[PDB]
Amino acid sequence: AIRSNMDVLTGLPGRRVLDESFDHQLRNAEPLNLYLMLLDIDRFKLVNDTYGHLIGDVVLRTLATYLASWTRDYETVYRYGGEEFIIIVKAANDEEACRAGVRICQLVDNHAITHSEGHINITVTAGVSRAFPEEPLDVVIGRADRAMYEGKQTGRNRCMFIDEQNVINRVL
Ligand SMILES: Nc1nc2c(ncn2[C@@H]2O[C@@H]3COP(=O)(O)O[C@H]4[C@@H](O)[C@H](n5cnc6c(=O)[nH]c(N)nc65)O[C@@H]4COP(=O)(O)O[C@H]3[C@H]2O)c(=O)[nH]1
Ligand SMILES: Nc1nc2c(ncn2[C@@H]2O[C@@H]3COP(=O)(O)O[C@H]4[C@@H](O)[C@H](n5cnc6c(=O)[nH]c(N)nc65)O[C@@H]4COP(=O)(O)O[C@H]3[C@H]2O)c(=O)[nH]1
Ligand SMILES: [Mg+2]
């Protein structure tokens, strides 16, 4: 069968589910603020080159399961790209959204991925942005992407926030 609302590998909803639902989610976030958390597996190409793509698939499937287990039910985890996940967070303020982001980064770092021949330690870099009313998804992801990139530049295994001045800081 063809199930366009599910990533076959991880079982998570994919890009199309977020793209199609984002405007609705943002409209109905009130009275809360909506935040977008973009997560990329650190040096994932290297994992595949070292262990092979079958093991890479285990990493993706396991991380998906982990993220699902580490998030609240109304905050959906998507597999947005090949090595990229998105979590849509609703929160009262920036500090709460950033706490969600940094705790998820910390959990990833602290839970090895079991595979047949041992264990692999992975980390993620995360960028978080507020979605302002009526903004399209590409703008929100664009800003989170800037935050995430600065995270990769400054050491990886961390969560970054881009604020209302479009200035990026690491979340501690
Ligand atoms: N550190 C931290 N982690 C958070 C927070 N919100 C969600 N999580 C994480 O997301 C997982 C799933 O949350 P849930 O579906 O709401 O499902 C939760 C929730 O229904 C409940 N629960 C656990 N602790 C609390 C709590 O302190 N307050 C409330 N109201 N419920 C809790 O038990 C379920 C399973 O909890 P966990 O195994 O801990 O698993 C939690 C935890 O890993 C948070 O604010 N801080
Ligand atoms: N929307 C959203 N907000 C998040 C998430 N994670 C953290 N926050 C926000 O950050 C506040 C502090 O989280 P914390 O330091 O983990 O501090 C948390 C944590 O120690 C615990 N807690 C709450 N829920 C859970 C849970 O489901 N599992 C576990 N293990 N602890 C929880 O209670 C403390 C207070 O929780 P809150 O009053 O809810 O207050 C939370 C909440 O407003 C998230 O995944 N989604
Ligand atoms: Mg749950």
UniProtKB/Swiss-Prot annotation:
This is Diguanylate cyclase DgcZ. It comes from Escherichia coli (strain K12). Substrate binds at N48, H53, D57, W70, T71, R72, D73, Y74, E75, K90, R99, R103. Binds 1 Mg(2+) ion per monomer. Pathway: Purine metabolism; 3',5'-cyclic di-GMP biosynthesis. GO terms for cellular component: cell pole; plasma membrane. Keywords: Allosteric enzyme, GTP-binding, Magnesium, Metal-binding, Nucleotide-binding, Transferase. Residues 32-164 form the GGDEF domain. The chain holds residues 127 to 296 of 296 of the full protein. Disruption phenotype: A slight increase in motility. No visible effect on curli production. Decreased biofilm formation, very little associated poly-GlcNAc production, and a complete loss of aminoglycoside-mediated induction of biofilm formation. The record marks K45 as: Transition state stabilizer. One of its GO terms (molecular function) is zinc ion binding. One of its GO terms (biological process) is negative regulation of bacterial-type flagellum assembly. Mg(2+) binds at D40, I41, E83. The keyword Magnesium applies. Optimum pH is 7.5.
